[PDB]
Amino acid sequence: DEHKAHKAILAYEKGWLAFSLAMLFVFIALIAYTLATHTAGVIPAGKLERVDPTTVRQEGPWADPAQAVVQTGPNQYTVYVLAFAFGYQPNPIEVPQGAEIVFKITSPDVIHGFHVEGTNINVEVLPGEVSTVRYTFKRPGEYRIICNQYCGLGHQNMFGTIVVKE
Amino acid sequence: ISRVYEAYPEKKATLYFLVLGFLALIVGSLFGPFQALNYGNVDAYPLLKRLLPFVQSYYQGLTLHGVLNAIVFTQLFAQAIMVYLPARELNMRPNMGLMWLSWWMAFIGLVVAALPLLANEATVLYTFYPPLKGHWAFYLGASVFVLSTWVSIYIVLDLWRRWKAANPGKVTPLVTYMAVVFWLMWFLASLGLVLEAVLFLLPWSFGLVEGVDPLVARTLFWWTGHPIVYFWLLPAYAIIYTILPKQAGGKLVSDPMARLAFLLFLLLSTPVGFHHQFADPGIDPTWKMIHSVLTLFVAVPSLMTAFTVAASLEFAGRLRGGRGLFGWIRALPWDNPAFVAPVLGLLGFIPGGAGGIVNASFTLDYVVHNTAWVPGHFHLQVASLVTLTAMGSLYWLLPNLTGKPISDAQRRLGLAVVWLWFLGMMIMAVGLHWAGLLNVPRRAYIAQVPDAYPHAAVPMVFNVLAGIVLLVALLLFIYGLFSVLLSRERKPELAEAPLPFAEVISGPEDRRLVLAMDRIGFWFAVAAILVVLAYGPTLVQLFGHLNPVPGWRLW
Amino acid sequence: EEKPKGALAVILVLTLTILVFWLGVYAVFFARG
Ligand code: HAS
Ligand code: HEM
Ligand code: CUA
Ligand SMILES: [Cu+2]
Ligand SMILES: [Xe]
Ligand SMILES: [Xe]
Ligand SMILES: [Xe]
Numbered sequence A: 001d002e003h004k005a006h007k008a009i010l011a012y013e014k015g016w017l018a019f020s021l022a023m024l025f026v027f028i029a030l031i032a033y034t035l036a037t038h039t040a041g042v043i044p045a046g047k048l049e050r051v052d053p054t055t056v057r058q059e060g061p062w063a064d065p066a067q068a069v070v071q072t073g074p075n076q077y078t079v080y081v082l083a084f085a086f087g088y089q090p091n092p093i094e095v096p097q098g099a100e101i102v103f104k105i106t107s108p109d110v111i112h113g114f115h116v117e118g119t120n121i122n123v124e125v126l127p128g129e130v131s132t133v134r135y136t137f138k139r140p141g142e143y144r145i146i147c148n149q150y151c152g153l154g155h156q157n158m159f160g161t162i163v164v165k166e
Numbered sequence B: 001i002s003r004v005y006e007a008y009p010e011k012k013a014t015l016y017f018l019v020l021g022f023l024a025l026i027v028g029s030l031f032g033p034f035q036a037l038n039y040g041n042v043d044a045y046p047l048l049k050r051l052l053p054f055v056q057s058y059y060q061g062l063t064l065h066g067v068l069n070a071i072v073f074t075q076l077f078a079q080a081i082m083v084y085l086p087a088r089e090l091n092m093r094p095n096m097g098l099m100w101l102s103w104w105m106a107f108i109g110l111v112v113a114a115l116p117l118l119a120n121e122a123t124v125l126y127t128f129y130p131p132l133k134g135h136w137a138f139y140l141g142a143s144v145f146v147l148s149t150w151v152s153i154y155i156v157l158d159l160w161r162r163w164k165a166a167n168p169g170k171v172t173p174l175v176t177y178m179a180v181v182f183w184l185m186w187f188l189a190s191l192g193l194v195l196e197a198v199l200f201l202l203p204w205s206f207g208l209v210e211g212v213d214p215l216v217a218r219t220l221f222w223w224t225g226h227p228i229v230y231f232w233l234l235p236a237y238a239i240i241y242t243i244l245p246k247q248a249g250g251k252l253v254s255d256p257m258a259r260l261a262f263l264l265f266l267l268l269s270t271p272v273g274f275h276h277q278f279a280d281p282g283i284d285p286t287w288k289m290i291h292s293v294l295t296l297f298v299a300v301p302s303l304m305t306a307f308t309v310a311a312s313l314e315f316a317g318r319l320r321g322g323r324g325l326f327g328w329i330r331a332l333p334w335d336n337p338a339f340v341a342p343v344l345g346l347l348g349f350i351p352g353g354a355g356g357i358v359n360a361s362f363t364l365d366y367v368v369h370n371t372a373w374v375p376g377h378f379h380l381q382v383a384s385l386v387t388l389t390a391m392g393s394l395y396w397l398l399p400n401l402t403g404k405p406i407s408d409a410q411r412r413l414g415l416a417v418v419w420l421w422f423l424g425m426m427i428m429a430v431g432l433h434w435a436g437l438l439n440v441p442r443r444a445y446i447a448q449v450p451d452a453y454p455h456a457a458v459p460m461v462f463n464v465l466a467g468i469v470l471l472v473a474l475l476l477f478i479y480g481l482f483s484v485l486l487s488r489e490r491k492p493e494l495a496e497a498p499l500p501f502a503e504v505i506s507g508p509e510d511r512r513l514v515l516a517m518d519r520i521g522f523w524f525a526v527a528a529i530l531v532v533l534a535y536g537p538t539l540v541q542l543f544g545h546l547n548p549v550p551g552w553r554l555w
Numbered sequence C: 001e002e003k004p005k006g007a008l009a010v011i012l013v014l015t016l017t018i019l020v021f022w023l024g025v026y027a028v029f030f031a032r033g
Helices: A003-036 A038-042 B003-007 B010-039 B045-051 B058-090 B096-118 B136-166 B174-206 B214-225 B227-242 B255-268 B273-277 B285-297 B299-319 B327-331 B337-359 B362-368 B373-379 B381-392 B394-402 B408-437 B454-485 B510-517 B520-543 C005-032
Strands: A069-071 A076-084 A087-089 A093-096 A100-106 A112-116 A122-125 A131-136 A141-146 A159-165
Touching: A003 A038, A003 B285, A003 B299, A003 B362, A003 C005, A038 A131, A038 B362, A069 A093, A076 A093, A076 A112, A087 A159, A100 A122, A112 A131, A122 A131, A122 B362, B003 B010, B010 B045, B010 B058, B010 B096, B010 B381, B010 B394, B010 B408, B010 B454, B045 B058, B058 B096, B058 B136, B058 B174, B058 B227, B058 B381, B096 B136, B136 B174, B174 B214, B174 B227, B174 B255, B174 B520, B214 B227, B214 B273, B214 B520, B227 B255, B227 B299, B227 B337, B227 B381, B255 B299, B255 B510, B255 B520, B273 B285, B273 B520, B285 B299, B285 B362, B285 B520, B299 B327, B299 B337, B299 C005, B337 B362, B337 B373, B337 B381, B337 B394, B337 B408, B337 C005, B362 B408, B362 C005, B373 B381, B373 B408, B381 B394, B381 B408, B394 B408, B394 B454, B408 B454
Parallel strands: A076 A100, A093 A159
Antiparallel strands: A069 A076, A076 A087, A100 A131, A112 A122, A112 A141, A141 A159
């Protein structure tokens, strides 16, 4: 008693530990799995791609919203998106289904979020930096973009739109 | 006018830390219910605006909420517990010059930062992410406030060194061990914020520079930004390991398991920050994977804890006449809020941690990042476990420090407070997690766009319920806290009582294991190499290609 | 006395809650891929 308890407890304890690590490694594997599939496309680009937030909408890929989408492969479209204080450009963004859409998103002011309702696209958008994410919609239609990073007083109203064309 | 202050003057300083801490918790938490209603799709803010006229927007309120609750309350509680407990264990006195200088730093720093916050000059939330530019007195105030802890680190290192000298060869006592690796951990951790503040935020808000690189700023932030939650937790763990078992009528079933847990926190708390930056650009995916792994390892200490504590409570339960596979649960002292409060805390901490381990799984984070789920996650962690622990500990700590006793009336009002808070927090956590799976973003005044989230109809109800429950609980806490700090009933003899530290069951195999762990200098240096290795590569590459951008005020 | 049945029971619950959360969300991740 009490000294008995002690050995028992410390015994089961090592058990519990070995079990726990095992289960953690199982998660480690299942994560590594997703990193090998198509679904890992949403992981932001690692390379630094610097831009100037004060000239972003005057000269460059983000200047003219009518130049936002650009076919850059046989089935690859690059969309230059701008998240700015209280909206998105272009609005709406119009893309084809079953194509690989490469988003390159930046901000002329503060930090915004780019959350595409119904997808795994959830990326922070930093001024002075390009956030590059890849994604292939499968399902058609009206995807809503939500800002999920506090940006000011109009944050809660900062929505946008994707039109993925059937 | 207190002799009890004159042999134990560390008692007084402790009390000032606690009181200042709970005041901050009260003030911050007012905004809670309103924020819960807001997530229930109700707009209560005009009512608030009518009561508290200085309140200019939902976001000013949320800045006050985060800052007073998550930053101020938690740091002052840590400072009070992780200085006083080791001091009483060692029966030594803390350099009282320095102790009172640390309390002033925190108090002056608080008041300096309060002004701009209250005056709507710093509505940037508790994470204050550039380019959002607050007033200079917010950054200066916070700096001083946080730096206070550097003094606390010194004080406990001192006490340790002095005890070491008077007991050559002896292993560091448990509580003091916890507090030492605790404060060393925090020192390592705090360098990220201090670097951000000294290199960028302070010159920036003083005028010296016009720009700040957002990516480096938030990379440095989250250097500190993760370990800081462990800075919130471990004072509660210190109490749960070394005080709860006694309140439950049992013993800590393992000393070395408790040391191991805290050692692992020193080792793995800091080099995991990129888990907060999964959705950021300009950080290598490889490094994110690495940090995701280290983050799952940092879960191990809390997995250990969950067994050890559980074991100790089972053990306590049995001593009390613990029946079968759940008898021990009923045999515990559910009539004592010091016991109840942190036990409930630890209940909610199960969903809490499970959420965290989700958030930690790299790719899975894209599901929940910046959504109502993350607030769901952390109210189970800090607003429940840590806060309940704190509240509960009023029932033994307050009397120890003041000599004021605790009526049976107060003890029962306590229990009500504790059950409501806990029930309120659980309801909310379902609300927020559900809403977060439905894409509802966090940090949003969503009641101002009523038609935006129709699919979150039923969880919005839960949030409304929580808001009401937690308001009541908060009110009853204020009532009950003051009733205890406003009476003149004073037994100096209970002020002279020992802290209800629990006894520890020891084994043979302890010795060598405990001895290895006491090699603090070694383990400190290993902890620091880990930070260099986890952050060094990335930081070097961000500093090579700085891209500052101007500030903005959008409130 | 003996085997810590209650402790085990607690970590069981913990284990199960972790699995429902993880696998639960792992599901949703693929559903949104
Ligand atoms: C004090 C509160 C804090 C704790 C503690 C905490 C724990 C973890 N969290 Fe976290 N968290 C993250 C991952 C973790 C992980 C892996 C853990 C782990 O340390 C948790 C381990 C816990 C366990 C493994 C549970 C053990 C359970 C026990 C020990 C209870 C047993 C009960 C008993 C024994 C009682 C029995 C009683 C009877 C009567 C039978 C991640 C991802 O990596 C994010 C970013 C999400 C995003 O995208 O924004 C994050 C976000 C946050 C934020 C938001 C920050 C912001 O505003 O940006 C806060 C405030 C926070 C606080 C805290 N969090 N977390
Ligand atoms: C009165 C009880 C409380 C209620 C009803 C409550 C409710 C809420 C709600 C609904 C949010 C979401 C706000 C949003 O994202 O727009 C929130 C945020 C938050 N809460 Fe609480 N809370 C309470 C107490 C606490 C306590 C005690 C703490 C810490 C000890 C805490 C820490 C935080 C933090 C750090 C945030 C996020 C701040 C930010 O995102 O800038 N809360 N709270
Ligand atoms: Cu853009 Cu919130
Ligand atoms: Cu963290
Ligand atoms: Xe700061
Ligand atoms: Xe502060
Ligand atoms: Xe934080």
